[PDB]
Amino acid sequence: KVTGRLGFESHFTKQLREGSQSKDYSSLLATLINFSPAAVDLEIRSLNSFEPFDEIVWFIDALTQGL
Amino acid sequence: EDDDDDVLLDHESKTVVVDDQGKPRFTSASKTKIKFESRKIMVPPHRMTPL
Amino acid sequence: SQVFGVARIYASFNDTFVHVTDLSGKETIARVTGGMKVKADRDESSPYAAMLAAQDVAAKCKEVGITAVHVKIRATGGTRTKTPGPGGQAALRALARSGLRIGRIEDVTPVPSDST
Amino acid sequence: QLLKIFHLKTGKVVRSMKISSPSYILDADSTSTLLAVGGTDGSIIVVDIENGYITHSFKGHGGTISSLKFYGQLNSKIWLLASGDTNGMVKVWDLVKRKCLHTLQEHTSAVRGLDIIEVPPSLNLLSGGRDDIINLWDFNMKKKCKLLKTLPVNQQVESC
Amino acid sequence: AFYVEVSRSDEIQKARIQLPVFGEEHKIMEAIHHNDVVIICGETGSGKTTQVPQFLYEAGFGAEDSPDYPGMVGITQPRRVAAVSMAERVANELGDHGHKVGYQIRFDSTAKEDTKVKFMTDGVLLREMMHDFKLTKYSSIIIDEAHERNINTDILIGMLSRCVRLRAKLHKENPIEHKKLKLIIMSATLRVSDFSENKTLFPIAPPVLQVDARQFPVSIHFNRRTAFNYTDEAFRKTCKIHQKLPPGAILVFLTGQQEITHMVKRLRKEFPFKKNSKYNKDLETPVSKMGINSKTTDLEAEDIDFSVQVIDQDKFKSAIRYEEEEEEGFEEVLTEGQTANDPLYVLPLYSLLPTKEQMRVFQKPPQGSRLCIVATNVAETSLTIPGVRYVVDSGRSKERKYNESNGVQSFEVGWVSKASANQRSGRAGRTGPGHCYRLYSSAVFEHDFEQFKPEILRMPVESIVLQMKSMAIHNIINFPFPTPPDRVALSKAIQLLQYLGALDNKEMITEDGKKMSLFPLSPRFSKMLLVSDEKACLPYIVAIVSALSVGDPFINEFELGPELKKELRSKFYKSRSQFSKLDKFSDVFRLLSVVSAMDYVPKEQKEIFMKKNFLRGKLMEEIVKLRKQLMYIIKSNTSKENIAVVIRNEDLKSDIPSVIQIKLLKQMICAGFVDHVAVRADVLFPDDAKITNRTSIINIPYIPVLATRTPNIEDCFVYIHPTSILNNLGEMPPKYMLYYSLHLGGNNKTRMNTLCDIASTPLANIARKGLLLTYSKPLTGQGLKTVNLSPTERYCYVVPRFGSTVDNDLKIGWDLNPIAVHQKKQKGQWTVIKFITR
Ligand SMILES: Nc1ncnc2c1ncn2[C@@H]1O[C@H](COP(=O)(O)OP(=O)(O)O)[C@@H](O)[C@H]1O
């Protein structure tokens, strides 16, 4: 059944887009370390991988700035 | 916050108009049952009460 | 307006015959057997053999022009089984299915009055 | 099961219809795009072949249906159909008004081989048969009459 | 190599010497030898339509022996009647070479074998060029009468400029692997600078030439009045001409096939033959009447109805009110041997004629009978009639007229220009000193006849770029037109076609896009009439699109709105709340039901409903005129039998829709106007909206898609029009509304043209085909899980976002309710196939 207030996107990809426009990913990694591994797999399996590759190169540069 | 529910999915004539190259072209046809058969089978009167 | 043939379906042993005639009896139309469809010599009395035999007879008789068939089942008679085998019902089911109107199913198997 | 194969490089089954009776006579027009087919009961369907489906039904008749013919000149407004028969008759239909033009009961066997032409709407036709009679008619558009019989000694099949 | 020997007959040879197109042939062929793009600025009555391809065959175009030009020759008449008539003409002209001439008028016709100098049609060689972007075959291309500024001519030369550029570029280094391409353009006027000296069309400046002729004196006569029934005016005038005037044939410039056939049968009735041969010839001309060639051919200006026009006598006279017995042209004496009731060799000529009536113009009449043509613009520049002296002109030609943002869109017969009108009048003094009768006054001819416009200006750019996409050219933003339109507007057109589903995100046309491009109508209405062949809603939808295309029927505030005014406004509101209103309160069901009410009325009961329920007579009659024709058009294009369909009466008339059909037509008009949607501002800015019941109903702010949201308040905040059922009842407006267009009122409030209301899900189902909405990731936080079948399938549960709020550069957009989709994983992204019902 439906459920209201599920507005556009979850906080991982929202913070990823905000971090990519803000040139650092520190809060994104602070969330990503924090939340649960089942949820981590559930978001990281769907990273919107298609022809401009924005989300996936943002994730790779986020892990670069992480380690 | 009230969402509706809608699917939104997926006679004849008596004249002609032919073509620019001859070639006539008529309008549509009307629409187009199996049989009326019968079979009689006799019952011997010792299997009558079982029937 | 329909016209009538007569089936004369012969449910013999080791063979099955179907040949519709016009209802005098002289001018036979499309004699087939059970042998001239299957290729094994073991089941030329097959129900399947009689089935496609009756299908081919139905096609040829609709080609000629007869639409209904008074059907007459004959077993081999004599001092023998006196009663139709399976091939008779097989041909009957086939040409009752195959678009042909059926009339007056009978039994014309000969009865001996105690011959030899 | 009626099918049509486009003869060109697309040799696929373009259209496929389920006709009523097993038929044994077909004729396409002198032009293209008209195909008439009549079964072995009384039903003569005609089909526009481009966008292939039924354009006329023509229940009409009686008995199994013998040979038939079109009347086609390119860019006309006449478009008749000939419609022979087994019990001897010729029942001419048009295609622009879906009406039986003239009922003609005169023959004695299967009316094979009939043909339609005009000579100055005159439109003389000629219908042979398995009987030995070729029996041409004047065949006006409103009301028709007869002329000579001229009797060949054959069993005429497709008297062109 | 140089040339092959040609031959012609003696009388056509001396006719070519007598007509002045033989004088400039050597200078033209040397300009062709020295430059490819050659301009000719001739005229009608010269001979340049006929004999210049014969000059090209003389020059060696079509000669296999020349290694420079071994190719085909294509002559591109824009009208297929012109193509076949000039095909048989040059087949007569080349004579013993005359079997080398051919025609190709539709796409299904391919090249005939015996020709090397072949005629064709504009759309025919554009589809030829489309599937042959290289154009190996044709050594030359002849664009005649390109002065008309057709959309086909514009797209034609816009492709042909880059075509001849790339072909010459590949040829000039190597003649073996690449041949030349000689482009030869003609015209009737001399304003060919928009073809030659346009730097966007041609950075390289091409040479311009002339080769015009001579003309006998045309005596032009303008009438003291101007008649309403121009057919009866022209008929009365032409019976007086054939009764009293000296001999010389007649050309009657009139409008359409129906009027022309009526005038031809009336002229044959007035001047009949006793002879059976000529009587049967006129009978054949009256019998062979119509042809359409809907899809598998090129199209012309004989769609014969897309026109919401209307008329009256006070309307005509108020249009020509600047104009404030012995009549001109009635001067010369009737000659002996010419009876007043002479037989007349009458011939119709419209573009929808068969070939065996298109050849009968050029036959000499019986002796004692005078020749006569009743026609339209085919005999203006392409064709010319050998023997006319009197031409008589109604001054009205059927073309495209469309004005914007108000629901006026008509393919109507307007008023012809001054230049084209004088070009029509110049066919009078053509065989001798002739007489043109213009069926109006010279004050009318002064005022409402403009001097010098293109179809690319008269037609919407969305249909223009859809036409280019169906012809499969993709570099449209920088494509060389003579009048390149507004780049803002054509980018909005590409955006609109992406919104409607004609164009994908890589800009290639879809099948639904080609079925839109087949229509001679707007892309929005074409989408409507393509989609609504579902669950018996087509009479309702054709009534709605006919109403929006004809205009407002309701007499509402062009009048009142003390002792009778109150009762009249009260009974007017009662007529609103009567049979105009029974179904809902959205907006447009009244606009459906007033036309559904035109079935509940006998014909002699005609005036009482308009005069009671406040409807306009001519617009209410032309909507029920337009409905039959529009249903004919869309049934002809989408049904399985193209041409042979007919329209009966009750199926254009009516039935009554209950609930499923009103919500289905609601999503149909959503598919019509998917980018003219609007939201109540509580779901974007609930603080600025001030959502209360005592705010007036024309003050609850609405916000459109794709519009910029700057920190000013009233940027997107556009409001409801007073002429809806809101502002009349106004209880609580539903959140998502539709409009047709926007009109700014005097209080700087952009009022609307509101239509209907959707909640979430038919809006999503409509938008799915379009490229409006961008999906989210699968959202299964508290809900039920995504079920897969495969690594490329998905049964997930996603919220859609309408107005593309990803990287929000102020294009305002809103989310929808969550919906279950069925994805397919195309090329890295997850497109959607369908939805899932509950
Ligand atoms: N199909 C045809 N048959 C006979 N004569 C024609 C035909 N078409 C045009 N003509 C005549 O040829 C002459 C030359 O005109 P044409 O070359 O067709 O146009 P333009 O003057 O624009 O070049 C005209 O006077 C016209 O009457």
CSV table of N, CA, C and O in Angstrom, one decimal, chain B residues 12-16 18-30, chain D residues 31-34 50-51 53-56 74-76 79 95-98:
chain,number,residue,atom,x,y,z
B,12,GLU,N,-22.1,-0.2,-42.8
B,12,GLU,CA,-21.3,-0.1,-44.1
B,12,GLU,C,-21.8,1.1,-44.9
B,12,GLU,O,-22.8,1.7,-44.6
B,13,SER,N,-21.1,1.4,-46.0
B,13,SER,CA,-21.4,2.5,-46.8
B,13,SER,C,-21.6,2.0,-48.3
B,13,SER,O,-21.4,0.9,-48.6
B,14,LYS,N,-22.1,3.0,-49.1
B,14,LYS,CA,-22.6,2.7,-50.4
B,14,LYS,C,-21.8,3.5,-51.5
B,14,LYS,O,-22.4,3.9,-52.5
B,15,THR,N,-20.6,3.8,-51.3
B,15,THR,CA,-19.8,4.7,-52.2
B,15,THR,C,-18.4,4.3,-52.2
B,15,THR,O,-17.9,3.5,-51.4
B,16,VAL,N,-17.6,4.9,-53.1
B,16,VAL,CA,-16.2,4.7,-53.4
B,16,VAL,C,-15.4,6.0,-53.5
B,16,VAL,O,-16.0,7.0,-53.9
B,18,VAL,N,-11.5,6.3,-55.1
B,18,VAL,CA,-10.6,5.2,-55.7
B,18,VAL,C,-9.2,5.4,-55.3
B,18,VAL,O,-8.7,4.7,-54.4
B,19,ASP,N,-8.4,6.3,-56.0
B,19,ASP,CA,-7.0,6.4,-55.8
B,19,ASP,C,-6.5,7.5,-56.7
B,19,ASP,O,-7.3,8.1,-57.5
B,20,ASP,N,-5.2,7.9,-56.7
B,20,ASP,CA,-4.6,8.7,-57.7
B,20,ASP,C,-4.1,7.9,-58.9
B,20,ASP,O,-3.6,8.5,-59.8
B,21,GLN,N,-4.1,6.5,-58.8
B,21,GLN,CA,-3.6,5.7,-59.8
B,21,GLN,C,-4.6,4.6,-60.3
B,21,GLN,O,-4.2,3.5,-60.6
B,22,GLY,N,-5.8,4.9,-60.3
B,22,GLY,CA,-6.9,3.9,-60.6
B,22,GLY,C,-7.4,3.3,-59.3
B,22,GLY,O,-8.0,4.0,-58.5
B,23,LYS,N,-7.2,2.0,-59.1
B,23,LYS,CA,-7.1,1.2,-57.8
B,23,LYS,C,-8.2,1.5,-56.9
B,23,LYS,O,-8.0,2.3,-55.9
B,24,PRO,N,-9.4,1.0,-57.0
B,24,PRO,CA,-10.5,1.4,-56.2
B,24,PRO,C,-10.3,0.8,-54.8
B,24,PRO,O,-9.5,0.0,-54.5
B,25,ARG,N,-11.1,1.3,-53.9
B,25,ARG,CA,-11.0,1.0,-52.5
B,25,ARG,C,-12.3,1.2,-51.8
B,25,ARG,O,-12.9,2.3,-51.7
B,26,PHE,N,-12.9,0.1,-51.3
B,26,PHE,CA,-14.2,0.1,-50.7
B,26,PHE,C,-14.2,0.2,-49.2
B,26,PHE,O,-13.1,0.1,-48.6
B,27,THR,N,-15.3,0.5,-48.6
B,27,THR,CA,-15.4,0.6,-47.2
B,27,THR,C,-15.4,-0.7,-46.5
B,27,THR,O,-15.3,-1.8,-47.2
B,28,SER,N,-15.6,-0.7,-45.2
B,28,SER,CA,-15.5,-2.0,-44.4
B,28,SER,C,-16.7,-2.9,-44.6
B,28,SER,O,-17.7,-2.5,-45.2
B,29,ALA,N,-16.5,-4.1,-44.2
B,29,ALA,CA,-17.6,-5.1,-44.3
B,29,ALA,C,-18.2,-5.3,-42.9
B,29,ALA,O,-17.5,-5.1,-41.9
B,30,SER,N,-19.4,-5.8,-42.9
B,30,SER,CA,-20.1,-6.1,-41.6
B,30,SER,C,-19.5,-7.4,-41.0
B,30,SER,O,-18.8,-8.1,-41.7
D,31,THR,N,-7.1,-5.2,-62.4
D,31,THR,CA,-6.2,-4.3,-61.6
D,31,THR,C,-5.6,-5.1,-60.4
D,31,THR,O,-5.8,-6.4,-60.3
D,32,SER,N,-5.0,-4.5,-59.5
D,32,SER,CA,-4.6,-5.1,-58.2
D,32,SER,C,-5.7,-4.9,-57.2
D,32,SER,O,-6.9,-4.6,-57.6
D,33,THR,N,-5.4,-5.1,-55.9
D,33,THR,CA,-6.1,-4.7,-54.7
D,33,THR,C,-7.5,-5.2,-54.6
D,33,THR,O,-8.2,-4.8,-53.7
D,34,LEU,N,-8.0,-6.1,-55.4
D,34,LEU,CA,-9.2,-6.8,-55.2
D,34,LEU,C,-9.1,-8.3,-55.4
D,34,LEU,O,-8.7,-8.8,-56.4
D,50,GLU,N,-4.2,-4.8,-50.1
D,50,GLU,CA,-3.2,-3.9,-49.5
D,50,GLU,C,-3.3,-4.0,-48.0
D,50,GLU,O,-2.4,-4.5,-47.4
D,51,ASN,N,-4.3,-3.5,-47.4
D,51,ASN,CA,-4.6,-3.6,-46.0
D,51,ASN,C,-5.6,-4.8,-45.9
D,51,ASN,O,-6.8,-4.6,-45.7
D,53,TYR,N,-8.1,-7.4,-45.4
D,53,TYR,CA,-9.2,-7.9,-44.6
D,53,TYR,C,-10.5,-7.8,-45.4
D,53,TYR,O,-10.5,-7.4,-46.6
D,54,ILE,N,-11.6,-8.3,-44.8
D,54,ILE,CA,-12.9,-8.4,-45.6
D,54,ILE,C,-13.4,-7.0,-45.9
D,54,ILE,O,-13.6,-6.2,-45.1
D,55,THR,N,-13.7,-6.8,-47.2
D,55,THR,CA,-14.4,-5.6,-47.6
D,55,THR,C,-15.9,-5.9,-48.1
D,55,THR,O,-16.7,-5.0,-48.0
D,56,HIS,N,-16.2,-7.1,-48.5
D,56,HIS,CA,-17.6,-7.5,-48.7
D,56,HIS,C,-17.8,-8.9,-48.4
D,56,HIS,O,-17.0,-9.8,-48.6
D,74,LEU,N,-9.1,0.3,-64.7
D,74,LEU,CA,-8.5,1.2,-63.8
D,74,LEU,C,-9.2,2.6,-63.8
D,74,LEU,O,-9.5,3.1,-64.9
D,75,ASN,N,-9.5,3.1,-62.6
D,75,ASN,CA,-10.2,4.4,-62.4
D,75,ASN,C,-11.6,4.4,-63.1
D,75,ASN,O,-11.9,5.1,-64.0
D,76,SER,N,-12.4,3.5,-62.6
D,76,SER,CA,-13.8,3.4,-63.0
D,76,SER,C,-14.7,3.6,-61.8
D,76,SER,O,-14.2,4.0,-60.7
D,79,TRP,N,-17.3,-1.7,-61.1
D,79,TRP,CA,-16.8,-2.7,-60.2
D,79,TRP,C,-17.8,-3.8,-59.8
D,79,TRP,O,-18.3,-3.9,-58.7
D,95,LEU,N,-19.8,-4.0,-56.6
D,95,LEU,CA,-19.1,-3.8,-55.4
D,95,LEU,C,-19.3,-2.4,-54.8
D,95,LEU,O,-18.8,-2.1,-53.7
D,96,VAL,N,-20.0,-1.5,-55.5
D,96,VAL,CA,-20.1,-0.1,-55.1
D,96,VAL,C,-21.5,0.1,-54.4
D,96,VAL,O,-21.7,1.2,-53.8
D,97,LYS,N,-22.4,-0.9,-54.4
D,97,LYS,CA,-23.6,-0.7,-53.7
D,97,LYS,C,-24.1,-2.0,-53.0
D,97,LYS,O,-25.2,-2.0,-52.4
D,98,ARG,N,-23.3,-3.1,-53.1
D,98,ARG,CA,-23.4,-4.3,-52.3
D,98,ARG,C,-24.8,-5.0,-52.6
D,98,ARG,O,-25.3,-5.7,-51.7
